Design a protein around this ligand. Structure first.
Ligand SMILES: OCc1cnn2c(NCc3cccnc3)cc(-c3ccccc3)nc12
Length: 290
């Protein structure tokens, strides 16, 4: 740590406080995360090699005095902040499309290496002035696990959690990240969280009320899942036309696929990249006020 000078606190992560810091030597500006089981060390260490333009680079891992610091590339804003700042007019569709496309590329990369994020949310999506957006905390969930509360005791959001996780599936797949990103895509479009659940049951029921209570028809095997209850209310599915106005048909088509109940049927990142929605994708520059 003596190698870094903390400049300011840039946020509180699930695992610890994140600081903007300067390397006392190179002068390099980085994000320092203060998070140990040997299993966590190996897993995290492997993350140093999982490199992609849309994945926040893990520069170094520092384990000292039984403390763990992760040195990451620094980005100037997060998507949650950016969305709040664009509330009045919303993020232009071409930029939303570009962000989705890049995030899917980042997911496609990680998933091809059999690495899941597991906790995608606007706060871990970071953007720069060049129109890039990157995934932060990839792999940390498997390395340290996802808690119900953060180190500061703040509640870990459930809004983006896939239904299979809520239903007790122990071995969920890369499909859970596609679900989360679909929820995020909807939120960028409407300027409102799609399923802002405040408990595991509220999150589940919010999903059911919009997409319909899942059954064996749409999701073979669902009634068997650990936390499934035959007593769940049976709600009918709403039209995506009401859910994400005024997203065009291509966007709604893609969203609908990213939110398929059956994780096996849910579109993969790679297939999503080929969706017609991205036929006219461009890379606009956002207006950032740093
Ligand atoms: O992945 C490392 C990371 C790299 N940049 N970064 C940023 N940067 C944007 C920013 C924000 C505030 C001031 N200057 C810059 C925020 C968070 C974060 C962490 C936890 C919660 C929210 C944001 N994590 C990171």
């Amino acid at each position: 740590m003596e190698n870094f000078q903390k400049v300011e606190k840039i946020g509180e992560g699930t695992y610890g406080v994140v600081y903007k810091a300067r390397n006392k030597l190179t002068g390099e500006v980085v994000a320092l995360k203060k998070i140990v089981p040997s299993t966590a060390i190996r897993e995290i260490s492997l993350l140093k090699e999982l490199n992609h333009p849309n994945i926040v680079k893990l520069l170094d891992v520092i384990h000292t005095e039984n403390k763990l610091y992760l040195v990451f590339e620094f980005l100037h804003q997060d998507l949650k902040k950016f969305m709040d700042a664009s509330a009045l007019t919303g993020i232009p569709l071409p930029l939303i499309k570009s962000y989705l496309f890049q995030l899917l590329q980042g997911l496609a990369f990680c998933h091809s290496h059999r690495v899941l994020h597991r906790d995608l949310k606007p706060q871990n999506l970071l953007i720069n002035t060049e129109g890039a957006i990157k995934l932060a905390d990839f792999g940390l969930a498997r390395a340290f696990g996802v808690p119900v509360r953060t180190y500061t005791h703040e509640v870990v959001t459930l809004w983006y959690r896939a239904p299979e996780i809520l239903l007790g599936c122990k071995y969920y797949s890369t499909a859970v990240d596609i679900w989360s990103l679909g929820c995020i895509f909807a939120e960028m479009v409407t300027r409102r969280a799609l399923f802002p659940g405040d408990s595991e049951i509220d999150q589940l029921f919010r999903i059911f009320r919009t997409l319909g209570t899942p059954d064996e028809v749409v999701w073979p095997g669902v009634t068997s899942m650990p936390d499934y209850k035959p007593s769940f209310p049976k709600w009918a599915r709403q039209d995506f036309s009401k859910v994400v106005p005024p997203l065009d048909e291509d966007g709604r088509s893609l969203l609908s696929q990213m939110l398929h109940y059956d994780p096996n049927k849910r579109i993969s990142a790679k297939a999503a990249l080929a969706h017609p929605f991205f036929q006219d994708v461009t890379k606009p520059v956002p207006h950032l006020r740093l």
